[PDB]
């Protein structure tokens, strides 16, 4: 779903559209800020790319069986390629244009930017306690690029959303680069019965995406695969 | 006078959607047309396959399918190559004329968004001067394959000369014949204060020349306004002629139609009865 | 820019006559870009089943359309015909003539 | 040739309300639809309602439209606002008779302001477990009339709310919370 690239290399994102329809199928760049708009689309009768007005003809190409399978290769990746690519094709009746599962873009020019997320969770304040009889469990993933993160909260070992709340958006930590790794938070409220139990696990489960296996790392720090990274706290009686 | 000319519309609404047209033409009349589902000459007529051969139409049909797909699929790059604009439209248009008996006077000219182009001249795609240079660009690539213009020189100078010359004696029937016409009268959109507009339709007469007139006896009302000559679904033709008077001088006046399927018995119709009324 | 604007006409192949069979043409010609889509009306309404003629150009590079279909006049029955071209701001309806 | 511009592009209203969305756009064709689309935050693109060239004002569900063609003005009513239909709305053109592609509007963000029984806002400090002597200050119980804020320096670090996942019955509240290096660490006046 979220792929990296560094400047100069190559993406082939996949297509996961439903099933087989009408034969064209049109890809869409969808940025931050801006209106999306169609890069080229895919002539199934002919097996053919045609492209949009001002796109050089070297840059995108698509290939492979229609039905879910879909490939679009970019090559020569500049930084201004990031962004969400969606694949679009028309219903039957050309009602609606049926839109695919969205894959977000992100180059950078140095791969060392990437960097995994360091969660913390922040044990409730005892005022806060207080007069509320509720539990305030802040989980905090700071310090990562790109800025896709999936964080879940998790009691026992059982993934609960029933009381949770989280950033929409993250925060870059210092807004003046592009290469800026950014933070997220994420609050949790717990009966005060509950959280003064200390036989409860509350595990703050953080997914991040980076490098994959295939990637090449050139640095003595661990490498920023895709991997998960959570932190855990403990109930305190008094 | 007569001319026998294959016309080509090419259609690009967007990057889909593109229509493509091909039809045959007795100078007002629809002979042939293209069947893309099969890829095949429809004749309209039993007579528009001429003197050819079956054996012979088959290559016809071969050379129109291979130059059509080879044509009208290397234009969508070329719209990407260049800065065409959707919509664009191209439209080719060749043939040959009957001068005096027949023969010599063939033509072959393509226009890109309606205006001229390019043409081919006896071997070669000369630009319109005024058409700038990218019909120069198109010109050199429609010059550098010799063998298509070698066909192209071939089917100007032999195949449609020797074609028309079969399709107007297979066609004699058809296009000597004469139709009546029938007329009526009515009246018209009325000008200002005073004044009426006579109107004078003449409908289903073959062949296309006509004679039409408001008269007032032997007097010729040279008032007369004879508009455009339409078609109808057949091939008659349709005529309306008005006139417009002052509305204290409107009788006397009568329409008369000659036309070579009367032979001489002129249509005369005379404003009386409820029209007066 | 160079693009044309069509010229609608609108006849009758025969003399009104109510209860007897006549046809409707329009003419819609000297037009450029093709896409044209005309409409013949009865009383206001679209009239289904209307046929036409392929499409051609005149010498002048414009194209022409006949749109003809078979029809009994009444007395209270009105036809027009409706032209919808990328030159019109709004679709131009050209009424048929009667006395 | 075609332009569609979507004015605003943050929006907020409390949820079991009605809020407009407006869409103006600028084309050259006598037939043609419009789209409107639900981008959901995950990246995730769906169709909501369209709206045709001379076809009535439209609807379905809780979705409506204004159509106003004369000055080419469609505006997207959502009535009875929920909690899950809170993503950001594009409006699209395209051609009614050749359709290839979608003239997008550049995007209207409309989040939902949730119900607020008895509000009690307040300002709280928590430590990590860690212990790496790293603190966070969290303001909770904010009503939906209040901010979201941010403050200067270029340290301190201060959030914009946030909203409940499947959340069955939960404690559906408002907190923001905001961290620096310790050092002032002064959580009862850094919100102010
Ligand atoms: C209804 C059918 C049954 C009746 C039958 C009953 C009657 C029987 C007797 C009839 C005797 C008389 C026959 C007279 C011939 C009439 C000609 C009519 C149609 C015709 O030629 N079609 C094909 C031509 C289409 C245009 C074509 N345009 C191009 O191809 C490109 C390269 C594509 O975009 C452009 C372009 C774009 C924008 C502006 C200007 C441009 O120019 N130009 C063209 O000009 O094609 C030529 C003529 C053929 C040719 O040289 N081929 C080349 C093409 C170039 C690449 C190299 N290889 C080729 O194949």
Same mark, same amino acid.
């Given at each position: ?21 009408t034969g064209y199928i049109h890809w869409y760049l969808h940025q931050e800020g801006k209106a999306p708009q169609r890069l080229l689309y895919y002539d199934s009768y002919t097996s053919s790319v045609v492209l949009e007005s001002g796109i050089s003809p070297g840059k995108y190409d698509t290939y492979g069986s229609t039905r879910k399978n879909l490939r679009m290769i970019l090559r020569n990746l500049i930084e201004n390629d990031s962004g ?155 | ?277 | ?11 009758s192949r025969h003399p009104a006559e109510n209860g007897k069979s006549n046809f409707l043409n329009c003419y819609v010609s000297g037009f450029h870009p093709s896409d044209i889509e005309v409409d013949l009306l009865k009383n206001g309404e679209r009239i289904e089943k209307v046929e036409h003629s392929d499409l051609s150009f005149s010498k002048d590079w414009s194209f022409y359309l006949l749109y003809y279909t078979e029809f009994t006049p009444?007395? $209270?029955?009105?036809?027009?015909? +409706? ?8 679709? $131009?309806?050209?009424?048929?003539? +009667?006395? | ?192």
């Open positions: 779903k979220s792929v990296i690239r560094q400047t100069g290399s190559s993406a082939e994102i996949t297509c996961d559209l439903a099933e087989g329809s969400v690519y969606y694949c679009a094709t028309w219903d039957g009746d050309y009602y609606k244009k049926l839109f695919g599962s969205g894959t977000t873009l992100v180059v950078t020019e140095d791969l060392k930017n990437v960097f995994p997320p360091e969660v913390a969770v922040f044990e409730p304040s005892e005022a806060e306690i207080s007069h509320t009889q509720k539990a305030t469990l802040v989980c905090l993933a700071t310090g990562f690029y790109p800025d896709h993160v999936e964080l879940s909260w998790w009691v026992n070992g059982k993934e609960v959303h029933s009381g949770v709340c989280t950033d929409p958006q993250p925060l870059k930590e210092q807004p003046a680069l592009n290469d800026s790794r950014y933070a997220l938070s994420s609050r949790l409220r717990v009966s005060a019965t509950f959280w003064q139990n200390p036989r409860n696990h509350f595990r703050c489960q953080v997914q991040f995406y980076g490098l994959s296996e295939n990637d090449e790392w050139t640095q003595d720090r661990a490498k920023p695969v895709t991997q998960i990274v959570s932190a855990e706290a403990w109930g305190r009686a008094d | 006078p007569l001319s026998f000319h294959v016309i080509w519309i090419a259609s690009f609404y967007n990057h889909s959607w593109k229509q493509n047209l091909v039809s045959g033409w007795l100078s007002d009349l629809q002979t042939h047309t293209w069947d893309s589902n099969s890829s095949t000459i429809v004749f309209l007529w039993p007579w528009s396959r001429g003197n050819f051969s079956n054996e012979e139409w088959k290559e016809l049909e071969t050379l129109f399918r291979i130059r059509t797909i080879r044509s009208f699929e290397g234009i969508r790059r070329y719209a990407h190559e260049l800065q065409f604009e959707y919509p664009f439209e191209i439209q080719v248009t060749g043939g040959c004329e009957l001068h005096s008996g027949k023969v010599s006077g063939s033509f072959l000219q393509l226009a890109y968004q309606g205006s001229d182009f390019v043409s081919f001249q006896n071997n070669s795609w000369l630009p319109y001067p005024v058409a700038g240079n990218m019909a120069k660009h198109f010109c050199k690539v429609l010059n550098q394959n010799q063998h298509e213009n070698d066909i192209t020189h071939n089917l100007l100078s032999d195949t449609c000369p020797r074609f028309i010359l079969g399709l107007l004696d297979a066609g004699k029937a058809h296009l000597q014949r004469q139709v009546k016409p029938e007329a009526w009268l009515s009246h018209g959109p009325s000008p200002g204060p005073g004044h009426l507009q006579l109107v004078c339709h003449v409908s289903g007469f073959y062949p296309k020349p006509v004679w039409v007139m408001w008269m007032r006896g032997e007097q010729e009302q040279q008032g007369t306004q004879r508009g455009d000559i339409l078609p109808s679904a057949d091939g008659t033709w349709y005529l309306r002629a008005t006139l417009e008077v002052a509305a204290g001088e409107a009788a006397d006046l009568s329409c008369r139609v000659k036309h070579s399927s009367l032979e001489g018995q002129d249509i005369v119709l005379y404003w009386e009865g409820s029209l007066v009324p | 820019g160079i693009q044309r604007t069509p010229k609608i006409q609108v006849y009444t007395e $209270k029955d009105e036809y027009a015909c +409706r032209v919808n071209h990328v030159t019109l701001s709004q679709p $131009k309806i050209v009424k048929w003539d +009667r006395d | 040739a075609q332009k569609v511009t979507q004015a605003q592009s943050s929006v907020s209203m409390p949820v079991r309300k009605a809020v407009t969305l407006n869409c103006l756009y600028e084309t050259s064709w006598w037939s043609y639809y419009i789209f409107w689309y639900k981008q959901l935050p995950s990246k995730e693109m769906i169709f909501l309602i369209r709206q045709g060239s001379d076809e009535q004002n439209a609807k379905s569900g809780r979705y409506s439209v204004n159509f106003k063609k004369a000055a080419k003005s469609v505006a997207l009513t959502i009535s009875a606002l929920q909690l899950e239909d809170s993503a950001k709305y594009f409006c699209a053109l395209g051609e009614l008779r050749w359709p290839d592609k979608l003239i997008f509007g550049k995007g209207t963000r409309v989040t939902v302001e949730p119900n607020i029984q008895n509000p009690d806002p307040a300002v709280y400090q928590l430590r990590d477990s860690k212990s790496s002597d790293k603190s966070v200050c969290l303001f909770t119980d904010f009503d939906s009339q209040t901010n979201v804020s941010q403050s200067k320096d270029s340290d301190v670090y201060i959030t914009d709310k946030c909203v409940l996942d499947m959340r069955s019955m939960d404690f559906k509240s408002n907190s923001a919370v905001a961290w620096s290096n310790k050092s002032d660490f002064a959580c009862a006046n850094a919100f102010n």
